[PDB]
Symmetry: D2
Subunit: 472 residues, 4 copies
């Protein structure tokens, strides 16, 4: 069962909008909204969305596998060896948020302070002592962006696996000699950095120039979660505030995906007339170029929705029913909708890109969609005995070597329940950089924004006040 299997199972359920049913349903961890900072829903005047992996949740592992296959084909087409075509995507390997070390060709899972939690070279998981040879302080400077690339997005999942595949392949292929910073083939030297750049470029190519979009839209049922409750929730949002879309995708793709997401024989509820997807939004903005959008942005343009091309000129007019915008900035939205920062709840999956920047730069309130939570929660609950044992051992050790080896064993067994690279949120008792970012920048979070449907209009989401140690 993948996380998108969980999301689709919940998607197939009709909405029971009886008060007591709703209260009961959001008791279950699976349908809850989780709260890092208190948020009075009654004060939200505008709800904003990203599209990809927010409204349009791509099915796993099918979509990652398609991305993987096309990226591989692109590398082969530009001259990588034919053996790449024997690779096959494996969803059990990658966890999101890993760091690729371009100097030494390792995938690293780190905490918020750059401490190494996991290190793999290809498919070889490197133990603590061996890690010290390349990482003397078991530490990386993560803002050294010339060296380290953080694979934080869901679109980075196939390249996460591909990087490890390529390191493994070149290591084990007798044509190549393994060196500390890459692979030697006579008078040719391929650095891990050059290899990484080729992979990144190929992923980019597949998304922007290749066939990924075309292959997705030709089989939307295979690739995209569809849920009759989406229009219901959006309709309810629109009763109490404004609704906007701000997506980096182009109009033609947006229109295809969104048309599919609303293609039911009814509107918001069963029995109601179907309405076009555009009718759910007070403002539609494509080609957003986030994160630049949250600063200077780009010139505001208007989409000719008949051709899918941009009209000639910067758009200087007012908000008009039926207009579709392109480019602009976050100020466009605030200006056109008459909203100030804290009046906006912005709903997205990009915890760097959108969520962090909207909060830091504009003071927007945030809702982070974490699709993997839909399955990670099932593991967390199923294996809570293991975590409880882990806490207990950390405690017993503190109050003072068999205990340390045991901590390592339990940490490993727990972690392997999630996959080879462990939980998105932790390795054993140590939180990941990703977890830290979610806590710091996501006011609310959940496996799906649809979970908002189960809380009433003016719900007050509550988090405990934080005290300093000297205050506690």
């Amino acid at each position: 069962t993948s996380w998108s299997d969980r999301l689709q199972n919940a998607a197939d359920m009709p909405a029971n909008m009886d008060k007591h049913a709703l209260k009961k349903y959001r008791r279950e961890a699976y349908h809850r909204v989780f709260v890092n900072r208190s948020l009075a829903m009654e004060k939200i005047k505008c709800f904003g969305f990203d599209m990809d992996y927010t409204l349009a949740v791509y099915k796993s592992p099918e979509y990652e596998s398609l991305g993987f296959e096309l990226t591989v084909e692109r590398l082969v087409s530009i001259g990588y060896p034919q053996e790449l075509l024997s690779f096959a995507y494996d969803s059990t390997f990658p966890t999101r948020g890993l760091v690729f070390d371009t100097l030494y060709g390792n995938l690293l899972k780190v905490d918020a302070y750059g401490n190494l939690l996991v290190c793999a070279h290809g498919f070889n998981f490197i133990r603590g002592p061996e890690t010290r040879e390349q990482y003397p302080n078991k530490f990386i400077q993560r803002d050294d962006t010339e060296r380290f690339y953080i694979l934080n997005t869901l679109f980075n999942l196939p390249e996460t696996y591909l990087l490890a595949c390529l390191v493994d392949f070149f290591t084990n292929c007798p044509r190549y000699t393994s060196c500390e910073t890459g692979f030697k083939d006579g008078d040719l030297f391929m650095s891990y950095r050059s290899m990484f750049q080729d992979v990144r470029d190929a992923v980019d190519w597949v998304h922007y120039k290749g066939s990924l979009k075309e292959k997705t839209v030709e089989n939307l049922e295979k690739y995209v979660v569809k849920d009759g409750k989406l229009p219901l929730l959006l309709s309810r949002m629109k009763e109490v505030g404004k609704v906007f879309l701000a997506t980096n995708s182009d109009y033609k793709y947006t229109d295809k995906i969104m048309t599919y997401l609303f293609d039911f024989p009814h509107g918001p509820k069963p029995g109601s007339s179907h309405r076009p997807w555009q009718s759910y939004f007070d403002l539609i903005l494509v080609d957003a170029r986030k994160p630049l959008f949250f600063g200077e942005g780009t010139v505001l343009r208007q989409v000719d929705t008949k051709t899918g091309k941009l009209k000639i000129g910067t758009y200087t007019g007012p908000l008009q029913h039926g207009i579709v915008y392109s480019g602009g900035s976050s100020d466009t939205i605030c200006d056109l909708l008459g909203a100030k920062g804290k009046d906006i709840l912005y709903i997205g999956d990009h915890i760097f890109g959108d969520i962090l920047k909207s909060k830091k730069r504009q003071g927007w309130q945030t809702f982070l969609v974490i699709p993997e939570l839909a399955q990670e929660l099932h593991v967390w609950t199923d294996k809570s005995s293991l975590f409880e044992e882990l806490q207990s051992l950390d405690i017993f050790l503190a109050e003072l070597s068999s205990i340390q080896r045991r901590i390592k064993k339990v940490t490993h067994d727990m972690d392997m329940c999630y996959g080879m690279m462990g939980s998105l949120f932790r390795s054993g008792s140590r939180q990941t950089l990703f977890a830290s970012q979610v806590m710091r920048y996501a006011d609310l979070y959940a496996a799906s924004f649809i979970n908002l449907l189960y809380y009433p209009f003016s719900y007050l989401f509550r988090a405990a006040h934080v005290l300093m140690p000297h205050e506690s």
Copy 2:
């Protein structure tokens, strides 16, 4: 009673090194080390120090007042009006960590997310609704460094007060017309930005070219906390690891201050021979130029300790007993002492500058000295009833207008106990940006690093593990 009165009172006490006495003494909040992240003291191999406001704690309000007076005199000397000479420093106004808004001439206390907690224009505290005119979202983008300057250091305390004095002065002087971004005098317009730049430049001048250093060293008893336990603690550190000094100050000043700090008729303990301050350090580095020090740094030089001038040349040799270094980088220290990041406990007061950068860039463990805590703790404990009432009201309100007005009243009364700009750590129930930074980047903290004396060599400082909301 100022915070430095508290520090000096504790400084006058002799050390009772009986095990049970030590355990008893560090029960008291005043002599405790507070813990944000667990730290096994037995693994620390090197203890590093800053000097100013760490080893050399300047007495309050005397030192701030001297800084203030010299800065005022400098402004008058470059052409500011004579009325400035009637100002007198008032320690009840400034709290550290305030943001000066150079557009509108306000001092702002903010939370970690840029939300406005307090706004003062001169000495006029601006209420919530009036704040919305200039801050529509009650929010500032704090990384807009062209507009906002964060007054985070103890050396910034006199300029914090001076800025408010100047805004008040120009506002009330009939020669000037108050405008939204500054003051008009016929054909001259003084922006708040230009005014701020003059103040900043004058503070810089007083420190580097003016008489501040000279006036301090001519009366060290008036200006600097002195504590016979300092050599005891440093001696004990040196029994179990290496000790270093890394200061931005020059050798001549360092030598004066440090000689004073060790000027007792004994060495580490009463009855022991006095030893020169230099003998307490395995490595002494001056002219450090932190924060640059934690990246590329500067060329490593050697001080001729007879003249106080630099020797000709970059120093290429090994660690030598008696050598004093100048410039270099954090890598110099690691290289010369054979330490890796986590093996170092770095002790300082600069929560941006040193503590943040040493942790983020180098993975050093950190101990933040917060001199104001020595008094803020006394207020916290004395007024805990008020805080408890505040929590209770926030709770009662949550579970559902007399309550809101009451929350405002209690918030005000609590805050005024600390000073006009409230606690360094909070306004009512909302934590400040400063508090957030301390929690994020200071592994340990206290009013004085001397509090380490009361914990045994291999003490394990413990903090509770952090859980995400979905994990809780």
Copy 3:
């Protein structure tokens, strides 16, 4: 007769290599090499080439017209109005080296000091007094690259004409209102800057992603000058030094073009065996990325000449017969051929890009190909009476209003002999920026590098020494 008609006429002639014939032939201005600084050919150890408009001279106006047509089609495809398809390239309008002013939408011909010589808005040539409204000092700051774009390359000829076409079109189309900085259409405003960016982007697209290359290679006879003397000259160069190619073009295109340039039923001379084009070069480098090439460059790669793809890895080996390189830097060439700067004569058409940078950054000697000279020389000689009259009038005026108006009339008539935007090198008696650059950075220049064939191996090209005014 276009300049490429002149080049092709000379191209059809067989080489008479009799000593006296050669001496006679290079007397004619058309077959001469012109000399800005003395150059002893006997000291040149390496001859280097660009390809486009140097070895491969595209026929005029056919190639410009193709570029124009494809750029137009691209603009229409992205949403420009259908009326663009009625445009037709006119070689009588553009002269190379004009400046597009993105603020006011003018094409400007300037001198070396930014003084305005000619100003056209669309097809309206703006007289001196009217120019003062937008250019008060009849001066532009040409290094203000946010505002001004200098159209210095032969590939910029079609966009030079297209810019003027678009300004004319929008000005005269009643759907648009002409404004000082662009065109208003209700709630849309198209700035001249946005328009320019679209044109530049479209030209780029046509070259890199569109059908320009494909359409050129499918009819090389229509689009490319071919000359049996090219292999003769290259063969002679190789007898006395090394020969290299350094082109920004890719291997597949290079191979097509160069194969065509050498496709005769003979090698260097009639009667000799044909040899592959590659055999004429000691070093072949494609994907050069000039101008970056003359600094840090890019990683050195090797082309798999069977597939036209790059081999995996940076190339670390030595110069090998048959190897084709990609990327690298100018240092690659010097290193692999054992040459120092002044030992190299670098032959190209890009007077900024290559010629300027190779001279300034590397101290290479330079030969600038100026294809337009092949026709401009014919005008210069035919109309020398007009220029002589112009000089005489400037003289007579100096020694002291009928004379001034007469100077203007003769200037106009002379200039119109070259085209609507006048000579590449001057307007009347005032030299252009382009002329100044040629004099400053081209050691030698000619309409074709083939003119080197008419000078003996160790010819000493001589220019008069320059004296300062006080030395004269």
Copy 4:
């Protein structure tokens, strides 16, 4: 006889303003204005000046010697060896415009294309073949500003000599070991780069914080050329246009120097009432911060001329009689005087800094003062036989080894007539970078701007039109 001896001798002469006398006087090379580009004086509406080395010409070698002595004393005070105090300035060594190579510690005289004309290491003049070891192409990339510093100003003369002194000193002192990039003293290594930075910093210090200004103003007769014709010329300029001063110096220094320059018992002519120096200027601007002045500049301020301090505020008012400005930009001048670029003749000695930037950025016309010309002209005329022989030999050689050695000998003998580093304008038949810059950016030039006094109000300065080689 120094160049300032020549200037002062001419300064002592009274002005004979008879028409025929003036025409006769400007026949002599010494009193001529030299012309690179034609300039109609009748079109100049504003005359602008720098002060230092333009209005206030410092006497040579006295002023250089004072600068030298103070710079030496500063280096010794910061820890350089006592032997530095035995150095004594020697005006026969430095020529202006030399390049210090911080890698190898050489002074280089170069042409406009970076070709080496002269290379000295300390006082050792390195022959051509030995130069190839460090400069394989006898070429430097002069815009590599991390490595090369061009000593183009008259204030750089003492440091030019000091650099060579220091290289010589360290080379010959047995305490130091000479290395390729600096000097080793055990565990200390002083790079030529570090040494250069110390010298540059010390020169800066002497000018801004040291006693240079004070020592100059206490003996203005020793240090500054004074000429009764200065007020006459300025008075005549003011009859036909506006006059401005734009100086980087501060008001207090400016006032001292200018008061001295006008301190005669008369005004413009003998017999006329003395007038304050300020009365000769329509606009006085100090603290100009050229070259930044010719772009964004700095905030416009007003000087309180009673205190010499700045008034509080940016100055927003109009041009007012008696006001003295500080900061601003070149646009300030144009705006306040109602002038456009070409209407301004800007008179200065900084051929980079002011003259180049005013021409390139603003289109101002330029007059370059070259104080050394007042003596270099005497050498040029006296030794014209040697130059003529040199030309003749270059000619005879061209038309075709005894000749080459002879060219070298004559080049040397000619060059030594000017000093050890030769003429400012050439080495033998090769022009220097400085000469090239003067020709390119100085419309007019002379040993003194006073030479303008000898041409009538509306004189047309004429230069021959430049022709390209193909046009000639």
